[PDB]
């Protein structure tokens, strides 16, 4: 049902497990239920988080999209993230 | 290859942009040229004089990241009275979405300065561009 | 309508989601299907508030306005560790660097 993503600062993040699932990188460390992130700083995965849940609401959706938001501060940490996540 | 088709039959659309971009218009011409049409500010619309079987595509004005136009690349006006043409973001990857920010905020000759890997400058450089997105569309 | 929440205590986050018309009670019975900790040993906050069981998350705040899945709304977490309720604290995230010369 659900799995704890942990930052590299021990934050955890517990999330649906098939919003988890919409990286392929989480799969393949998933295949516990808990994933250990060294390089992925909490301020930054908790936006992956919030991504998955963004994504998984409006994906397949005819409602009107708003912008994922993302501060200049983060955008750097966040792209690396992602690029790591294949999000 | 993608091209519109010379019916000179008018159809009447609404180009509705329910997006917060500014939307660059894009017809693809009889040679299937790229050709720019009139900017869309967020929010507002247009009734637009097209034609059936022509061949429509929506971007971002400033950065040229693509749009949604009724949950597709691709707006063909069909026989009417008007036809809606809905314009909306897409759900980007989360990497396009942060590749789109640094690239707001980083002037290109500054790339090279950003404490990143290789492949990711080479993807910054990789701008959303309209050539590269139809060619291919296969 | 669907609300979509953060629910936080100490350095835990569960991201999830709940109906404005469902009750802070029964975000309480999500609280213990994954932290296993039953609903009388849990006390949930908006900001330094406490909420009441039997109020819905709309009445609490909650709306579909507020809490949006790209910006979900926080809810406090703390646990009765034998008789007596241990007082709200949530570890803040940590702190991004400084914007770089060219940002
Ligand atoms: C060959 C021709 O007459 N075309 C090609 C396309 O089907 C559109 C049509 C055309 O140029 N119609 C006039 C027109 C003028 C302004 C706009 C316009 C204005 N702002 C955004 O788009 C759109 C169509």
Known sequence: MYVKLISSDGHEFIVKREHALTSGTIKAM???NEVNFREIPSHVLSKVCMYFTYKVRYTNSSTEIPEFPIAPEIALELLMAANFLDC | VLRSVNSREPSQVIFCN???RVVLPVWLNFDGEPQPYPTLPPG?????????????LFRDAGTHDGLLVNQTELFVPSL????????????????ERCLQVVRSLVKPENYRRLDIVRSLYEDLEDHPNVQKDLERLT | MDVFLMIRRHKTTIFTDAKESSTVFELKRIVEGILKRPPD???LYKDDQLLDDGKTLGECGFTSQTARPQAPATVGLAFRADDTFEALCIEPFSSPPE???VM
């Open chain 1, 30 to 32: 998933l295949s516990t």
């Open chain 2, 18 to 20: 329910r997006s917060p």
């Open chain 2, 44 to 56: 507002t619309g247009r009734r637009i004089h097209s034609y059936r079987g022509h061949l429509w």
């Open chain 2, 80 to 95: 009417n009275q008007p036809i809606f043409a809905n314009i909306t973001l897409p759900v980007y990857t989360l990497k």
């Open chain 3, 41 to 43: 040993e849990q006390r």
């Open chain 3, 99 to 101: 914007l770089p010369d």
